[PDB]
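Thought: the user asked what Poly(ethylene terephthalate) hydrolase looks like in 3D. I have the sequence; next I should run the structure tool and report back without guessing.
Action: structure_tool
Action Input:
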Amino acid sequence: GSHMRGPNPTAASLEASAGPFTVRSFTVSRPSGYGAGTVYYPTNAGGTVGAIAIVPGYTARQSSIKWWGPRLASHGFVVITIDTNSTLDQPSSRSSQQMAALRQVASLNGTSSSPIYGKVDTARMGVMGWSMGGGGSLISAANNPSLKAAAPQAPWDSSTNFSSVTVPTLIFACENDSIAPVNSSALPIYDSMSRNAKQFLEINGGSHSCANSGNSDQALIGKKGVAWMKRFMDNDTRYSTFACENPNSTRVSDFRTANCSL
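Observation:
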């Protein structure tokens, strides 16, 4: 059961600011269980694509995570970036709101007036998000093991125990993070997971915002995020090497991976 879309990938095609597909977007008129949303979608994917829901961190809005919308959608995904009901929502609330955004993407897929009418395979979903939104993605993964992939960035939760997670999980970490330090957040979270395909990519000298909109590593972080979601959401074995490989880059201060075949 694989869903291969678009051309065979290259390091160049994955590092490029845009994938093969044309992207359009819309504002969600009446958000259902979250604050606000922008849906990014390919106009010409040539098949149905999985959906990814992306949540910001405490105080933060869609602008912090917006770069993922076009980057992922242009390789064959529907991406919803959300604002939370409150900028001060905690990780459990962020998780509920992430899953509500995936639910509304499914609703719009079934809405004849929506630009994503019949564009989504609702069987193939993924979760991403920054800091408390990264915590929220891991909670979403632990509560909903049918999710095909998770790729949180600089995750924080009040607990680091995610030992139940079976969803393929890529953690972006920021080496000099002083908000959710790697040694007390991202790494203990990574270490807790013994049941899944997983990866840990730490950005050299990165602050807490090292994977946000306006970061200086979008070629490397974009290639890894796209490759992970293509490998695991689409079961697209053309991305096994990109998804699972040590990228061998002086911008990476630490690389870890388990249960990930090349």
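Thought: the tool returned a structure. Summarizing for the user.
Final Answer: Structure for Poly(ethylene terephthalate) hydrolase predicted. The CA atoms of residues 144 and 167 lie 9 Å apart. Helices lie at 11-15, 68-73, 91-109, 132-143, 186-192, 218-233, 240-244.
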